[PDB]
């Protein structure tokens, strides 16, 4: 089977540089044009660059001309993208892609890599502040109480949230992170439990921020109002 | 450049329904238009090229048509594996421009949201910031009006909404709306209210609280 | 400094014609605005393998920005017997059967 194995996740400061690689197997690499395609909030799904089988022709979307260079090594079956002067709007998942027919110019793609997340941001590494979303009369309806944790101001993605170390799973909703104005991420995780259990059962949200190797356990105290 | 558009951006459909989605080019691309399917967290998969030729291994319920500037992708009888996002792509000439994508979601009956509101915690106020969270739990469809009010004054530009994906068990959505104020502004006002309008509700629902009563 | 391959579609304007030298001429139009670019052109033994045979004679097969809707003639030296004229590369390439008499 065709395999396209791309390099690992990259985090760059604005103006910085980065090189992506993609190791191919399962087909005659030297007979196919190869392409880079990206998918991010700034541009959607967007073709970036193509290089012919013999590296004689190279093509670029206008926004990367002069900043990005595509190349390949046919003796190691490897595709490269050399990105320089990276801006915040370049943040995207970058995909390795193989042309359907041999000896082409990258018209159609029948095999793709797993993708490489590239984040370009000047924000500093920061673990999240966890604030309780305490249940009260304003979050109870028909014996059902809503509680949760506000996971605010962190960088970079992702965080994971569990409840009671994974013992509580039914009714848990963890929203997708939103990029705040300050360049930091923020989300909430909520869960619905029986309001009768608020007196006897303890609820703790377990927030893990793997990029900083930190963890915050927050006990959500019920309100008496 | 040739601008590629798609319609609609999102639609809901049921298993067995006939689904048609549209791709348009600002000027003619003749027949050189392809279709891709993408699941969350995966790369796209080639579905169809030259407008109507099925890629190898693609089931026969998919079909394409159109010419020049207007193209359609049709699923004759929708199956559960077909819930995904669909992109068209031109290849009359480089740049190999993709369309913006159409997401095919699961249709179900309307479900009203449960609405909950959360005052900011004392610890966060100590840091100088006040976040008020309004929660809309387990509703359908996704469209909802979430209007923040501070002493009657409609808020604008100081809140953010976040929505989950369709739940794997009941196909519902949940939504969080977060109002973010400085500590000084939060303490200059008394009444905080989140008013929710949704087709599952016979009338708008309002959750409100007075600052400092909890 | 060389030009990249043309990525848009070619069409034959008239039927290929044999010359006195035994070569074949091919008149094509080009739909692209991605010029300047290099015109791919070759002879092939069959349409499935596309194995190159013969030779392209035209020395300057280049589409310029001013080409637009004007017509280009390509000249190729085909092998004896059956072969195919192949203009362009990739999904949109066009082919035409050719037979060169003699031995």
CATH assignment of the domain containing B123: 2.60.40.10
Task: Please give the tally of structural domains in chain A.
Answer: 2
DSSP character for B179? E
Query: What's the rounded Cα separation, in Å, for the pair A2 and A23?
Result: 11
A166 phi/psi in degrees, rounded to 5: 90, -5
Tally of domains within chain B: 2
**Under a CB-based contact definition with an 8 Å cutoff, are residues C67 and C37 in contact?**
no
Q: Please indicate, yes or no, whether residues B186 and B151 belong to a single structural domain of this protein.
A: yes
- Sign, CA torsion B75/B81/B82/B83: positive
Chains contacting C (3 or more CB pairs within 8 Å):
A, B
The CA distance from A159 to A188, in Å, is: 11
Which candidate in A2, A57, A146 is best for mutational testing of the B interface (most B CBs within 10 A)? A146
Q: Where are the beta strands (DSSP E) in chain A?
A: 3-6, 10-12, 18-25, 34-40, 44-51, 58-60, 68-73, 78-83, 92-99, 109-112, 116-120, 129-133, 140-141, 144-154, 160-163, 172-174, 178-179, 185-194, 204-209, 214-219
The secondary structure of B114-145 as a DSSP string is EEEEEPPPHHHHHHTEEEEEEEEEEEBSS--E
CB atoms within 10 A of CB A181: 7
Q: Reduced to 3 states, what is the DSSP secondary structure of residue B183?
A: helix
Whether residue A130 contacts residue A216, with contact meaning beta carbons closer than 8 Å, is answered with yes
Distance CA C82, CA C44 (A): 9
**Residue B72 token pair:** 């359609």
What single-letter DSSP state applies at residue B185?
A: H
Return the CATH number at C29: 2.60.40.350
Residues of C in contact with B49 (CB under 8 A): 91
A2 and A74 part of one domain: yes
Q: Which two tokens stand for residue B103?
A: 């997401």
- Separation of alpha carbons C57 and C19, rounded Å: 13
Distance CA A213, CA A10 (A): 17
Residues in CB range of A200: below 8 A, 6 or more apart: none
Among all residues of chain B, which has the CA nearest to that of C32?
A: B93
CA neighbours closer than 13 Å in the CB half-sphere of residue B129:
12
Segment A46-53 long-range contacts (CB within 8 Å, at least 24 positions apart): A46/A92, A46/B98, A47/A106, A47/B94, A47/B95, A47/B96, A47/B97, A47/B98, A48/A81, A48/A94, A49/A81, A50/A105, A50/A106, A50/B94, A50/B96, A51/A79, A52/A104, A52/A105, A52/C4, A52/C5, A53/A102, A53/A103
Residue spans of alpha helices (H) in B86-210? 122-127, 183-186
Question: Does the beta carbon of A103 lie under 8 angstroms from any beta carbon of chain C?
Answer: yes
Q: Give the separation between CA C41 and CA C30, rounded to whole angstroms.
A: 13
Q: What is the spatial distance between Cα A168 and Cα A205, in angstroms, rounded to a whole number?
A: 10
Tokens representing residue B5 in the block: 């558009």
Give, in order, the Cα–Cα distances in Å from B15 to each of B39, B60, B83, B119, B165.
17, 16, 9, 42, 18
**CA A194, chain centre distance (Å):** 34
Q: What backbone phi and psi angles, to 5 degrees, belong to A203?
A: -120, 125
Which residue range(s) make up the domain with C22? 1-103
Does C33 contact B at CB distance below 8 Å? yes
d(CA A65, CA A61): 7
Q: Which of B73, B92, B108 is the last residue of a domain?
A: B108
Together in a domain, A38 and A105? yes
CB B86 within 8 A of CB B73: yes
Strands B102-106 and B10-13: parallel
Query: How would DSSP label each residue in A146-197?
Result: EEEEEEEEEBSS--EEEEGGGTB-TTEEEPPPEE-TTS-EEEEEEEEEEGGG
Residue B46: count of CB within 10 angstroms of its CB: 22
The rounded distance, in Å, linking the Cα atoms of B177 and B168 is: 22
With CA atoms as reference, report the closest residue to A68 among A97, A53, A48. A48
Q: Are A52 and C5 within 8 A, CB to CB? A: yes
B65 near B52, Cβ under 8 Å? Answer: yes
Residue C101 at interface with chain A, using a CB cutoff of 8 Å: no
Angle at A114 between CA A45 and CA B39, to 5 degrees: 60
Sequence-ordered list of residues with C-beta below 8 angstroms from that of C14, at least 6 positions apart, any chain: C27
Give the residue from A199, A205, A206 showing the smallest Cα distance to A222: A199
**Six token digits for residue A148:** 């949760």
Whether residue C92 lies within 8 A of chain A, CB to CB, comes out as yes
A138: left (phi over 0), alpha (psi -120 to 50) or beta: alpha
Is A74 within 8 Å of A56 (Cβ atoms)? no
Residue B120 contacts A where some CB pair is shorter than 8 Å: yes
**Distance between CA atoms of residues A69 and A19, nearest Å:** 9
Helices and strands, counts by H and E, chain C: 0, 11
Resolution value (Å, 1 decimal): 2.3
CA atoms within 13 A on the CB side of A211: 15
Contact B94 C91 (CB under 8 A): no
Angle A144-A147-A152 from CA coordinates, rounded to 5°: 155
* Chain A environment of B114 (Cβ under 8 Å): 141, 144, 146, 192
- Distance, CA of C64 to CA of C66 (rounded, Å): 5
Residues A16 and A91 in one domain: yes
Give the sheet arrangement for strand B191-197, strand by strand. B153-154, B145-150, B191-197, B205-210
d(CA C55, CA C41): 9
- Point out the domain boundary residue: B108, B128, B155: B108
Cα B157 from Cα B179, distance rounded (Å): 9
Nearest residue to B121 via CA among A223, A164, A6, C79: A223
The CATH number of the domain where A189 resides is what? 2.60.40.10
**Cβ–Cβ < 8 Å for A17, A87:** no
Nearest-angstrom CA–CA distance, A161 and A144: 21
Q: Is A67 on the interface with C (CB under 8 A)?
A: no
B48: its two tokens: 């169809």
**Do A116 and A94 meet the contact criterion of CB atoms below 8 Å apart?**
yes
The H or E element spanning position B184 is: helix B183-186
Name residues whose C-beta falls within 8 Å of residue B192's C-beta, 6 or more positions apart in sequence.
B117, B119, B132, B148, B149, B150, B179, B208, B209, B211
Backbone angles phi and psi of C7, in degrees to 5:
-105, -5
Same domain, A69 and A144: no
Six token digits for residue C1: 């400094």
Can you say whether the dihedral through the CA atoms of A160, A166, A169, A172 is positive or negative? negative
Rounded CA-CA distance C31/C8 in Å is 6
Q: Which domain holds residue B166?
A: 110-211
Q: Show the domain range for A127.
A: 123-225
Domain boundary pick from B88, B108, B128: B108
Question: Which residues does chain C have within 8 Å of residue A35's beta carbon, measured at their own beta carbons?
Answer: none
Residue A132: closest CA among chain B residues belongs to which residue?
A: B121
* Buried b or exposed e, range B151-187, using 16+ CB within 10 angstroms: eeeebeeebeebebebeeeebbbbbbbbbbbeeeebe
């Amino acid at each position: 089977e065709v395999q396209l194995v791309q390099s690992g996740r990259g985090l760059v400061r604005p103006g910085g540089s980065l090189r992506l690689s993609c190791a191919a197997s399962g087909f005659t690499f030297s007979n196919y044009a190869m392409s880079w395609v990206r998918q991010g909030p700034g541009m959607g799904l967007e073709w970036v660059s193509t290089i012919t089988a013999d590296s004689d022709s190279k093509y670029y979307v206008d926004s990367v001309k002069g900043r990005f260079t595509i190349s390949r090594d046919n003796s190691k079956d490897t595709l490269f993208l050399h990105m320089t002067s990276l801006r915040a709007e370049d943040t995207a998942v970058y995909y390795c892609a193989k042309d359907r027919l041999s000896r082409g110019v990258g018209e159609l793609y029948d095999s793709w890599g797993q993708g490489t997340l590239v984040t370009v941001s000047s924000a500093s590494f920061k673990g999240p502040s966890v604030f309780p979303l305490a249940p009260s009369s304003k979050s109870t309806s028909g014996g059902t109480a809503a509680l949760g944790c506000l996971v605010k101001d962190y960088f970079p993605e992702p965080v994971t949230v569990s409840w009671n170390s994974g013992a509580l799973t039914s009714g848990v909703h963890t929203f997708p992170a939103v990029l705040q104005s300050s360049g930091l991420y923020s989300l909430s995780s909520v869960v619905t439990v029986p309001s009768s259990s608020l007196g006897t059962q303890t609820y703790i949200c377990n927030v893990n921020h793997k990029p900083s190797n930190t963890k915050v356990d927050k006990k959500v105290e019920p309100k008496s109002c | 450049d040739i601008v590629m558009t798609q319609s609609p951006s999102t639609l809901s459909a049921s298993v067995g329904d006939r689904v048609t989605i549209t791709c348009r080019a600002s000027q003619s691309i003749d027949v050189w238009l392809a279709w891709y399917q993408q699941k969350p967290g995966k790369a796209p998969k080639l579905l169809m090229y030259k407008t109507s030729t099925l890629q190898t291994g693609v089931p026969s319920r998919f079909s394409g048509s159109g010419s020049g500037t207007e193209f359609t992708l049709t699923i004759s009888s929708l199956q559960t594996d077909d819930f995904a996002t669909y992109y068209c792509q031109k290849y009359d000439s480089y740049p190999w421009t993709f369309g913006p994508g159409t997401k095919v979601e699961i249709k179900r009956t309307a479900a009203a949201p449960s609405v909950f509101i959360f005052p900011p915690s004392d610890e966060q106020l100590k840091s100088g910031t006040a976040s008020v969270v309004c929660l809309l739990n387990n509703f359908y469809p996704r469209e909802a009006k979430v209007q923040w009010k501070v002493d009657n004054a409609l808020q604008s530009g100081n809140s953010q909404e976040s929505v989950t994906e369709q739940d794997s068990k009941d196909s519902t959505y949940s939504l969080s709306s977060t109002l973010t104020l400085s500590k000084a502004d939060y303490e200059k006002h008394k009444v905080y209210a989140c008013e929710v309008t949704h087709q599952g509700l016979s009338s708008p629902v309002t959750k409100s609280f007075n600052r400092g009563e909890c | 400094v060389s030009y990249s391959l043309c990525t848009a579609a070619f069409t034959f304007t008239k039927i290929p014609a044999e010359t006195l030298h035994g070569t074949v001429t091919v008149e094509v139009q080009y739909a692209g605005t991605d010029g300047p670019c290099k015109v791919p052109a070759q002879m092939a033994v069959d349409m499935q393998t596309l194995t190159p045979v013969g030779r392209l004679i035209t020395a300057n097969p280049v589409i310029t920005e001013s080409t637009e809707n004007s017509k280009m003639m390509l000249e190729l030296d085909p092998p004896f017997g059956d072969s195919y004229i192949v203009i362009g590369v990739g999904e949109k390439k066009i082919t035409h059967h050719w037979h060169r008499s003699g031995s």
